[PDB]
Design an enzyme around this catalytic site. Structure first.
Site, mmCIF file in Angstrom:
data_model
loop_
_atom_site.group_PDB
_atom_site.id
_atom_site.type_symbol
_atom_site.label_atom_id
_atom_site.label_comp_id
_atom_site.label_asym_id
_atom_site.label_seq_id
_atom_site.Cartn_x
_atom_site.Cartn_y
_atom_site.Cartn_z
ATOM 1 N N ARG A 1 10.479 -8.518 -14.605
ATOM 2 C CA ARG A 1 11.238 -7.424 -14.065
ATOM 3 C C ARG A 1 11.635 -7.832 -12.658
ATOM 4 N NH1 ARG A 1 8.943 -1.839 -11.704
ATOM 5 N NH2 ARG A 1 10.745 -0.444 -11.990
ATOM 6 N N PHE B 1 15.092 -4.851 -4.285
ATOM 7 C CA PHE B 1 13.903 -4.032 -4.344
ATOM 8 C C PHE B 1 12.673 -4.915 -4.398
ATOM 9 C CE2 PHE B 1 11.306 -1.144 -7.389
ATOM 10 C CZ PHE B 1 10.549 -0.625 -6.338
ATOM 11 N N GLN C 1 8.725 -8.604 -9.994
ATOM 12 C CA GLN C 1 7.439 -8.258 -10.582
ATOM 13 C C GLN C 1 7.125 -9.217 -11.711
ATOM 14 O OE1 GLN C 1 7.204 -4.114 -12.044
ATOM 15 N NE2 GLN C 1 5.534 -4.542 -13.406
ATOM 16 N N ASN D 1 1.356 -1.049 -10.999
ATOM 17 C CA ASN D 1 0.342 -0.288 -11.734
ATOM 18 C C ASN D 1 1.085 0.768 -12.530
ATOM 19 O OD1 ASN D 1 0.728 2.213 -10.147
ATOM 20 N ND2 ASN D 1 -0.500 1.325 -8.534
ATOM 21 N N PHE E 1 3.959 -7.310 -7.585
ATOM 22 C CA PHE E 1 5.370 -7.432 -7.259
ATOM 23 C C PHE E 1 5.469 -7.915 -5.817
ATOM 24 C CE2 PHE E 1 5.877 -3.393 -4.744
ATOM 25 C CZ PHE E 1 4.842 -2.596 -5.236
ATOM 26 N N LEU F 1 6.524 3.593 -1.661
ATOM 27 C CA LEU F 1 5.446 3.046 -2.445
ATOM 28 C C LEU F 1 4.147 3.090 -1.690
ATOM 29 C CD1 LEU F 1 7.054 -0.074 -3.953
ATOM 30 C CD2 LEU F 1 6.960 2.220 -5.012
ATOM 31 N N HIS G 1 0.599 2.016 -4.259
ATOM 32 C CA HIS G 1 0.421 0.632 -4.683
ATOM 33 C C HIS G 1 -0.368 -0.047 -3.585
ATOM 34 C CE1 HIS G 1 3.154 0.843 -8.031
ATOM 35 N NE2 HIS G 1 3.842 1.665 -7.258
#
Lengths: 12, 165
Positions: B55, B60, B63, B102, B113, B122, B126
Protein backbone atom coordinates in the site's frame (compact mmCIF):
# COMPACT_ATOMS: atom_id res chain seq x y z
CA UNK A 1 -10.13 -5.88 8.20
CA UNK A 2 -7.07 -4.50 6.29
CA UNK A 3 -4.69 -2.74 8.69
CA UNK A 4 -3.13 0.64 8.19
CA UNK A 5 -3.52 4.35 8.76
CA UNK A 6 -6.63 6.11 7.39
CA UNK A 7 -5.83 8.11 4.30
CA UNK A 8 -6.84 11.84 3.66
CA UNK A 9 -9.07 10.49 0.89
CA UNK A 10 -10.87 8.10 3.22
CA UNK A 11 -11.52 11.12 5.47
CA UNK A 12 -12.98 13.43 2.81
CA UNK B 1 22.85 3.12 24.87
CA UNK B 2 23.18 2.84 21.10
CA UNK B 3 19.89 2.65 19.15
CA UNK B 4 19.73 -0.04 16.36
CA UNK B 5 20.19 0.91 12.75
CA UNK B 6 18.40 -1.45 10.41
CA UNK B 7 18.27 -1.31 6.62
CA UNK B 8 15.97 -2.43 3.83
CA UNK B 9 17.32 -2.92 0.33
CA UNK B 10 14.35 -2.16 -1.93
CA UNK B 11 13.78 -3.96 -5.27
CA UNK B 12 11.22 -2.91 -7.95
CA UNK B 13 10.08 -5.95 -9.87
CA UNK B 14 13.16 -7.77 -8.74
CA UNK B 15 15.57 -5.01 -9.82
CA UNK B 16 17.34 -3.46 -6.79
CA UNK B 17 16.69 0.22 -6.34
CA UNK B 18 18.46 1.40 -3.20
CA UNK B 19 18.83 1.20 0.58
CA UNK B 20 16.72 2.94 3.22
CA UNK B 21 18.17 2.85 6.75
CA UNK B 22 16.33 3.57 9.99
CA UNK B 23 17.27 4.44 13.51
CA UNK B 24 14.87 2.66 15.88
CA UNK B 25 14.01 4.50 19.14
CA UNK B 26 14.71 1.60 21.46
CA UNK B 27 15.51 3.97 24.31
CA UNK B 28 11.97 5.34 24.27
CA UNK B 29 9.77 2.66 22.63
CA UNK B 30 11.71 -0.52 23.63
CA UNK B 31 9.15 -3.22 22.88
CA UNK B 32 7.97 -1.79 19.49
CA UNK B 33 11.57 -1.15 18.34
CA UNK B 34 12.70 -4.67 19.38
CA UNK B 35 9.87 -6.23 17.42
CA UNK B 36 10.83 -4.36 14.17
CA UNK B 37 14.57 -5.07 14.79
CA UNK B 38 14.21 -8.84 15.24
CA UNK B 39 11.89 -9.02 12.17
CA UNK B 40 14.57 -7.12 10.15
CA UNK B 41 17.34 -9.64 11.05
CA UNK B 42 15.01 -12.65 10.94
CA UNK B 43 16.57 -14.09 14.12
CA UNK B 44 13.22 -15.46 15.39
CA UNK B 45 12.58 -17.49 12.22
CA UNK B 46 10.40 -15.14 10.13
CA UNK B 47 10.57 -11.54 9.10
CA UNK B 48 10.53 -8.89 6.51
CA UNK B 49 13.06 -10.23 3.96
CA UNK B 50 11.13 -10.72 0.76
CA UNK B 51 7.87 -9.05 1.81
CA UNK B 52 6.42 -6.21 -0.29
CA UNK B 53 5.07 -2.71 0.25
CA UNK B 54 1.43 -3.46 -0.58
CA UNK B 55 0.00 0.00 0.00
CA UNK B 56 1.69 3.24 -1.18
CA UNK B 57 -0.31 6.47 -1.23
CA UNK B 58 1.77 9.29 -2.76
CA UNK B 59 2.12 12.30 -0.40
CA UNK B 60 0.96 10.27 2.60
CA UNK B 61 2.95 7.11 3.36
CA UNK B 62 4.38 3.77 2.16
CA UNK B 63 3.16 0.70 4.09
CA UNK B 64 4.49 -2.82 4.16
CA UNK B 65 5.39 -5.58 6.62
CA UNK B 66 2.62 -8.07 5.83
CA UNK B 67 4.88 -11.02 5.32
CA UNK B 68 2.15 -13.67 5.71
CA UNK B 69 -0.75 -12.41 3.51
CA UNK B 70 1.01 -9.68 1.48
CA UNK B 71 -2.14 -7.48 1.38
CA UNK B 72 -2.70 -5.77 4.73
CA UNK B 73 -4.53 -8.59 6.46
CA UNK B 74 -1.66 -10.65 7.88
CA UNK B 75 1.58 -10.26 9.73
CA UNK B 76 2.45 -11.22 13.33
CA UNK B 77 4.81 -9.87 15.90
CA UNK B 78 7.65 -11.60 17.70
CA UNK B 79 5.32 -11.41 20.75
CA UNK B 80 2.27 -13.11 19.24
CA UNK B 81 -0.13 -12.15 16.44
CA UNK B 82 -0.90 -8.77 18.07
CA UNK B 83 0.49 -6.67 20.96
CA UNK B 84 -0.51 -3.53 22.67
CA UNK B 85 0.21 0.10 21.92
CA UNK B 86 3.28 0.79 24.03
CA UNK B 87 3.04 4.57 24.27
CA UNK B 88 2.36 7.57 22.11
CA UNK B 89 5.23 9.82 23.24
CA UNK B 90 6.51 10.43 19.65
CA UNK B 91 4.47 12.25 16.96
CA UNK B 92 4.16 11.99 13.18
CA UNK B 93 6.14 15.20 12.67
CA UNK B 94 7.13 14.96 9.01
CA UNK B 95 8.53 12.80 6.16
CA UNK B 96 10.63 9.81 7.19
CA UNK B 97 8.73 8.92 10.45
CA UNK B 98 8.44 5.16 10.90
CA UNK B 99 5.26 4.09 12.66
CA UNK B 100 3.16 1.00 13.37
CA UNK B 101 0.30 0.26 10.95
CA UNK B 102 -2.64 -1.28 12.90
CA UNK B 103 -6.27 -2.17 12.71
CA UNK B 104 -7.35 -0.13 15.73
CA UNK B 105 -6.21 0.18 19.36
CA UNK B 106 -3.82 -2.54 20.48
CA UNK B 107 -3.49 -4.43 17.17
CA UNK B 108 0.24 -4.07 16.51
CA UNK B 109 1.70 -6.98 14.50
CA UNK B 110 4.39 -6.55 11.84
CA UNK B 111 2.98 -3.97 9.46
CA UNK B 112 4.52 -0.51 9.51
CA UNK B 113 4.44 2.64 7.35
CA UNK B 114 6.90 5.41 6.49
CA UNK B 115 5.28 8.89 6.38
CA UNK B 116 6.14 11.03 3.46
CA UNK B 117 4.37 14.01 5.15
CA UNK B 118 3.48 15.45 8.59
CA UNK B 119 0.33 13.49 9.53
CA UNK B 120 -0.96 14.97 12.85
CA UNK B 121 -4.28 13.03 12.62
CA UNK B 122 -2.36 9.82 13.27
CA UNK B 123 -0.96 10.99 16.58
CA UNK B 124 -2.18 8.97 19.52
CA UNK B 125 -3.44 6.19 17.19
CA UNK B 126 -0.20 4.78 15.72
CA UNK B 127 2.99 4.21 17.73
CA UNK B 128 6.00 6.04 16.25
CA UNK B 129 9.16 4.14 16.89
CA UNK B 130 11.84 5.18 14.34
CA UNK B 131 12.90 7.51 11.51
CA UNK B 132 14.77 7.22 8.15
CA UNK B 133 18.47 7.75 8.76
CA UNK B 134 19.46 7.65 5.01
CA UNK B 135 17.68 6.75 1.75
CA UNK B 136 14.84 9.34 1.83
CA UNK B 137 15.38 9.71 -1.92
CA UNK B 138 14.62 5.99 -2.25
CA UNK B 139 11.39 6.52 -0.26
CA UNK B 140 10.42 9.43 -2.64
CA UNK B 141 11.15 7.05 -5.54
CA UNK B 142 8.88 4.38 -4.12
CA UNK B 143 6.04 6.94 -4.04
CA UNK B 144 5.85 7.19 -7.82
CA UNK B 145 4.66 3.58 -7.95
CA UNK B 146 1.75 4.13 -5.52
CA UNK B 147 -1.75 5.39 -6.31
CA UNK B 148 -4.50 7.37 -4.48
CA UNK B 149 -6.07 4.11 -3.17
CA UNK B 150 -2.64 2.66 -2.39
CA UNK B 151 -2.24 0.10 -5.14
CA UNK B 152 1.23 -0.16 -6.61
CA UNK B 153 2.20 0.08 -10.30
CA UNK B 154 5.18 -2.21 -9.71
CA UNK B 155 6.07 -5.03 -7.28
CA UNK B 156 8.08 -3.24 -4.51
CA UNK B 157 9.89 -5.76 -2.29
CA UNK B 158 12.41 -5.79 0.52
CA UNK B 159 15.19 -7.70 -1.31
CA UNK B 160 17.36 -7.82 1.76
CA UNK B 161 17.35 -6.34 5.28
CA UNK B 162 19.21 -6.61 8.52
CA UNK B 163 21.00 -4.64 11.25
CA UNK B 164 23.92 -2.41 10.69
CA UNK B 165 24.51 -0.89 14.17
Amino acid sequence: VHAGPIAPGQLR
Amino acid sequence: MVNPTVFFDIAVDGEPLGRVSFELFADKVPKTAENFRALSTGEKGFGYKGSCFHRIIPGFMCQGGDFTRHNGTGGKSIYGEKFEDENFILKHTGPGILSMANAGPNTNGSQFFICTAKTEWLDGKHVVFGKVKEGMNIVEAMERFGSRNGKTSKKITIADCGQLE
